[PDB]
Ligand binder design. Structure first.
Ligand code: CA
Ligand code: CA
Ligand code: CA
Ligand code: CA
Ligand code: CA
Lengths: 177, 182
């Protein structure tokens, strides 16, 4: 049975672009699991408001992606600042995991951590300094077990896919004895 | 398995810094190693100390002062005439003989930290990597929780080149005990 010290925080962000120095966060989502990847609770899925000048200055790829998903319209309608979403996320996390206990879990986590550091530093500091990036395992699996790869940007569904991807590796790639 | 090429190799890297602040601290040491996709070491790269003025060295906290004093890195830094640009260029020169640009993920331990310093202080080198990371410490986090009984088998120094060697040895250890290779 899991405790406040034996749980994992999973997180995904959507941004206005790939520039970790300049672009904004427009969506955040979190999921809590135990050390054995059982989902315990899903956190708030929050769209962060951005002015139209920022949305209209996105490149074509991001305009297509975030428009088609409906994120852009949710961002327009949202009244939440980055700070509002940060506080709501923290309020949720504190009920499930103690501070500095969980590594930051998900796919391509370094990118997420860099955006969090600049725009949501208090949230960033709630994580342990370690990362648990499923894409590291994928890099190894592509090279050492290419035959299992055939078996494999909406924030909450993105996290579920990441958790599910790691369970796939646990079954076929890791010795669990 | 096929023989390795410029498109099927891995760049392992480690940096030593004046501290943990990715916004304000400096790089004082860099090393690289080239492996194939199956962790055969093909070539070890240049070990370079980057010069820093005394004010910056004096401002280091206790842990860094203790470690880098004992290891001989601080004195190497003082005597060094290399800038971060010099060290960046010598490394790039080594890498281009072994690996094509944007082919290899950034490999090592605590790689996100290294990438962030590289982005600020050696962006051309940072851009030579593929955007993905291969962080052995992710595997360690999994091993701590799923195979705690094997952690004691992990085996010294605090220098960049020794750090890379250790991360390669660590991953080889996981390959033998934690991964299904068949
Ligand atoms: Ca992510
Ligand atoms: Ca994302
Ligand atoms: Ca290091
Ligand atoms: Ca070897
Ligand atoms: Ca490192």
């Amino acid at each position: 049975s899991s405790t406040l010290n034996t749980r994992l925080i999973w997180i995904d962000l959507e941004m206005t672009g790939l520039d970790t120095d300049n672009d904004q966060i427009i969506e955040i989502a979190t999921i809590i699991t135990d050390d054995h990847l059982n989902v315990l609770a899903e956190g708030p899925v929050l769209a962060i408001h951005q002015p139209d000048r920022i949305l209209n200055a996105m490149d074509e790829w991001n305009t297509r992606q975030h428009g088609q998903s409906g994120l852009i319209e949710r961002v327009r309608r949202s009244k939440l600042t980055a700070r509002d979403a940060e506080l709501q996320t923290l309020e949720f996390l504190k009920k499930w995991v103690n501070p500095k206990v969980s590594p930051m879990c998900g796919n391509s986590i370094c990118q997420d951590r860099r955006f969090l550091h600049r725009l949501m530093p208090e949230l960033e500091q709630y994580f342990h300094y370690r990362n648990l990036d499923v894409s590291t395992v994928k890099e190894l699996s592509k090279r050492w077990r290419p035959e299992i790869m055939s078996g494999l940007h909406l924030a909450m569904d993105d996290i579920r896919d990441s958790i599910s991807e790691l369970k796939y590796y646990r079954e076929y790639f890791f010795i669990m004895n």
